[PDB]
Amino acid sequence: PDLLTNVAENYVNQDLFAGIEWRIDQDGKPIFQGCAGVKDIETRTFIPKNAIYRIYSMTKPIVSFLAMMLIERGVFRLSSPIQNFDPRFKSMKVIDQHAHIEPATALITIEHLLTHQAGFSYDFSLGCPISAHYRDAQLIEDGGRDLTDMMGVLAELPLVFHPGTQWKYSISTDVLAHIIECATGERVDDLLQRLIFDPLDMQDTGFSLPLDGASRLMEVYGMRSLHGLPALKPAPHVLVPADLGSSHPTDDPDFRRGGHGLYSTLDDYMAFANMLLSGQTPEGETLLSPAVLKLALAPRVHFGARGMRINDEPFAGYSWNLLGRVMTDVGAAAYATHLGEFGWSGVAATYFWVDPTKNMTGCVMTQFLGSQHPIGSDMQAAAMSML
Amino acid sequence: PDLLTNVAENYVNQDLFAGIEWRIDQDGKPIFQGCAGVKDIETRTFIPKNAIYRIYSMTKPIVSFLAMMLIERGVFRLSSPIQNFDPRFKSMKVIDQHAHIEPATALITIEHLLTHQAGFSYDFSLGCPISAHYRDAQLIEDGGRDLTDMMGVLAELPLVFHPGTQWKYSISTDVLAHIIECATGERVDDLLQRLIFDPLDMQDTGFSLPLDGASRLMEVYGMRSLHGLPALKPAPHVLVPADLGSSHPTDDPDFRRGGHGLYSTLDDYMAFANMLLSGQTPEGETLLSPAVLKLALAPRVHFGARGMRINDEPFAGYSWNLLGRVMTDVGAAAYATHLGEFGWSGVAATYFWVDPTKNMTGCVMTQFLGSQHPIGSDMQAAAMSML
Amino acid sequence: PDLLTNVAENYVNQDLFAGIEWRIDQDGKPIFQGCAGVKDIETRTFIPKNAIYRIYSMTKPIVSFLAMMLIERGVFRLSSPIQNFDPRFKSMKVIDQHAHIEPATALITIEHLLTHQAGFSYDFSLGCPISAHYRDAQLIEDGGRDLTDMMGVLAELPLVFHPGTQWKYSISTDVLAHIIECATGERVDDLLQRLIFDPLDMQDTGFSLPLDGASRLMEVYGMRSLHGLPALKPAPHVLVPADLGSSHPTDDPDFRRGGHGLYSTLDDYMAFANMLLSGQTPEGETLLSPAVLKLALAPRVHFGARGMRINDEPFAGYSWNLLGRVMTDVGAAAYATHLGEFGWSGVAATYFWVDPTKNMTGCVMTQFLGSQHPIGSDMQAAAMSML
Ligand SMILES: CCOC(=O)[C@@H](C)c1cccc(C(=O)c2ccccc2)c1
Numbered sequence A, B, C: 001p002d003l004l005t006n007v008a009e010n011y012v013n014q015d016l017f018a019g020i021e022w023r024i025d026q027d028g029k030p031i032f033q034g035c036a037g038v039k040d041i042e043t044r045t046f047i048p049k050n051a052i053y054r055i056y057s058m059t060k061p062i063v064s065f066l067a068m069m070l071i072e073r074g075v076f077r078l079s080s081p082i083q084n085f086d087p088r089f090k091s092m093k094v095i096d097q098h099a100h101i102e103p104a105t106a107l108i109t110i111e112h113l114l115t116h117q118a119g120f121s122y123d124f125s126l127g128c129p130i131s132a133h134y135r136d137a138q139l140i141e142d143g144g145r146d147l148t149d150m151m152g153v154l155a156e157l158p159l160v161f162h163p164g165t166q167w168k169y170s171i172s173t174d175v176l177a178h179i180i181e182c183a184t185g186e187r188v189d190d191l192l193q194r195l196i197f198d199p200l201d202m203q204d205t206g207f208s209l210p211l212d213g214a215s216r217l218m219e220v221y222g223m224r225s226l227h228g229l230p231a232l233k234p235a236p237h238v239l240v241p242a243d244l245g246s247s248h249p250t251d252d253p254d255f256r257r258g259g260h261g262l263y264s265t266l267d268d269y270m271a272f273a274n275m276l277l278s279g280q281t282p283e284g285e286t287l288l289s290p291a292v293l294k295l296a297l298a299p300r301v302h303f304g305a306r307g308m309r310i311n312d313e314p315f316a317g318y319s320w321n322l323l324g325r326v327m328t329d330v331g332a333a334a335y336a337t338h339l340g341e342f343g344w345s346g347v348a349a350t351y352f353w354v355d356p357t358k359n360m361t362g363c364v365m366t367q368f369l370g371s372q373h374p375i376g377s378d379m380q381a382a383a384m385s386m387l
């Protein structure tokens, strides 16, 4: 039975998601694919050809992969202190939950940024000692502010632990994008275009819409908390269009970020995921060598009893590598997977995975902010069960 | 020599405080007293007779003393669960710095409120997992909100540790004032009037100015942070009149709190401090029996090597009793004192102490919010050096 | 692209290294090789044919390999107490950072020497409880002193931990060379010649220059700290010829050491590295059996959270075996590698590796003391990326 269709259709029929697309490839070619629902429930327009999604933190594996290419090319290395490229990050301080502030005892490195061990936090982090000051500064909300300028504001705030000593999912991929710009003298969006998107023919992926993109953009549903104040409990899961404020412009030619902000399509993201099986384009051009791809995918952050968590949500059986999650214990996993399955996901419920043991990739595209329902993992589980 | 005058005149002559009054009594009679500076630097009006000060958390020993009287009279007991008097405090939750929320595993008691071990926080607590939600609710800022209603809003928010398991200086004295009202059916300001202020002849003490009070109210100086966002470093110490917003009304007949909000005078507060040497009025009427006064003053919360801290500011060598600080190790103390010295202080730099070994009481009144200079401790040390 | 050339040329063009040679072999034959820069910037003489390098601690894997040959031949064993061969090492003492001295509670063994777990330190060790006494004794500086005589002076000084209980990179390979002499009745340089260099046709490797060697010796650049006092921060990385004092003679026929002092060439060192893939010469003569080579290469010292460090510089993902470093966690590694990659390096920035998973060896020869730039690891990473 087509478990993937059953999951997606049940989600649409229960009024939980407006529209869903999915594709699963094996050996670089589609084996399962489908769509359910509509572009938007207001007009019930069908999902268009080459529909466009805000992929939020599925931007991070792309920007991280770019960083690995630059490491391979000698621009910087994992151990490089970021203050060597932007001195505004010299002399960081660390704050704790008891109001105590002290100088950081270790320099932030490229590796710390890629592993979320740098001590940064995030505006929406509930209970965080510093996230109120991120929100006051509007680091995420003010999407119109140039990346270079956002970093200057961020650099003045304290970290929430000494670099290297803990893990916390964070704005550090945005720092990484900025440090890439400092190190190369180029803009991160131009680098992504030349080094990744153009070689993989990802012609619909970028920080602004294509000229014909407005009619292809999927509507985004959900509730963003008033003033950005982190919610103490989930809002009701209701299909109401979300207000993104100025956080996610569609046609700002200077908007670029490391941790979110890309628009993409199912087809484009599958080209990226399939490349991660080998480090090569389908024509055989190498984007990253096998040795550095192995360095990027090896489990690098290991977690204690409570496991990997983001705002206390678990990622059971997962460790962290330089690009995102990686399954390191199927016996601890909460849904079907295989050892070494890796990938990431975004807050509008987009999700992808790469499963080297099956030469398999998969991606689910939808637009629902802060879903109470783990559609991405449900679709991965369905696809795993259908092999 | 008169070190007390020297300290006070130096502070005034360095443009650090506008006006200061102090008195030190021994055996219930004044032994040192003085005044320095002016009511306000704008007009340089002289400090009036019976000048009036916002005493902020010097409200807490008074409200705590009232609670001990009510315990003595059988209204409730230290072990009483506060949910027995207001069921809005049933089913509390606890939040941590990792965004994890769970049910409280102990009920909040009267003793927890008096010792700041209930798990409540404070709006201005820097780095606190929940203070951002206090600020969003304007618990402290909205002084026009009735105490009973402010408590309903607070009760819906999580604690930051399980009741009884830690110490954190907090809004719990306001909860105590509210629970007093629940338990007695009377208002806390009326109970304070009948049980404490009138027997001690504290005719100028209350939550609103006396009829002839506006001309005697000292000006308040200092910088309250924008939006109440807790500052990451001290603001420059400058004598600029402070803007209190709607947090501290002068003529609201329903304004009443437990942790702040009283107006008082040097002479009134000394009457209260002298009473704490015996539990008796000067006429010999008992406000609190010797046994319950001993219960209230005995060291009750003991601190680790980090010591007692508020927003990471230390109270070196102090433990906590049911009314405030108490000196338990002169060899750890950071300024002159004796074993058993007790008292408290307020954010506008008012300060008092009681020293049973010398039958001594002292009080410094001034108005500077968030002083970088610990005038209260400096004046205590001067008085200790003189006796 | 030729990443190796790009790295080397960038280092020369940025005035960071005078001259660099490299070679990478696979299956015993060169696959990548090159050179950049000059022998010396003063005259800009090109790097000569068979250029000679001071290889410093790349002496250690050679002397360690010699020790394994002697273990195989029954001269001594890993568990042999060194005091059995030189009684000046009976009755060692241990000093700590609190000035406390006590007798060592374990005897130093051959294995302790090969693993730097014997408790010795090094003259240049910053912050070390005993390195000031090494410097006073001029153990490293006085290169004219006979090895046998240096050992007598060293033997009178305390260790910095009990043998076997910790790891600290040390003068212990020099102790090993001396104990080899005691055990065999032969000089270490004669043993190296007969057992290793002559079988591998390493005709330019030794503790003094060949008769035609003076014109082939690469100039050495960098700053040695005045009086040998360990620096608190890196000196500026500037190409100024280094003053080696009497630490590294070119034509002393009795100069021999275990931890440094060899002159070699790229070609000679690659013959040694290639032999470590098999324990055999290219003609198939066995220098060390497969079983004892496996014993020598197996990870033997494992490190805690802070990892393997020398003067606080990290070797991320590396453990220690009887010959040097060995990669035991690619997920912790700071630059491209494979599980089981091993080798060592020297303070003038020479570096080599052996990668059994690729049947690969590599060596970078240059002369810069105390480089701020990890040229050896950069070149390894480049070569790994080019496979
Ligand atoms: C996957 C990428 O998520 C992010 O990193 C940032 C960019 C982000 C940006 C804008 C809006 C949100 C939320 O709507 C939200 C966050 C937390 C809880 C509920 C909703 C999150």
Ligand SMILES: CCOC(=O)[C@@H](C)c1cccc(C(=O)c2ccccc2)c1
Residues within 6 Å of the ligand: B055, B056, B057, B058, B124, B140, B223, B224, B225, B247, B259, B260, B345, B346, B347, B348, B369, B370
């Ligand atoms: C001593 C009693 O002050 C308190 O602890 C609480 C009751 C309180 C209540 C109302 C206003 C403020 C401030 O204005 C303020 C707090 C922190 C920094 C600067 C200003 C504080």
Ligand SMILES: CCOC(=O)[C@@H](C)c1cccc(C(=O)c2ccccc2)c1
Residues within 6 Å of the ligand: C055, C056, C057, C058, C124, C140, C223, C224, C225, C247, C259, C260, C345, C346, C347, C348, C369, C370
């Ligand atoms: C790899 C072999 O390093 C050694 O074991 C010893 C022989 C050594 C001998 C002579 C000079 C130096 C330094 O120049 C130096 C040491 C520490 C920091 C900066 C410079 C080191």
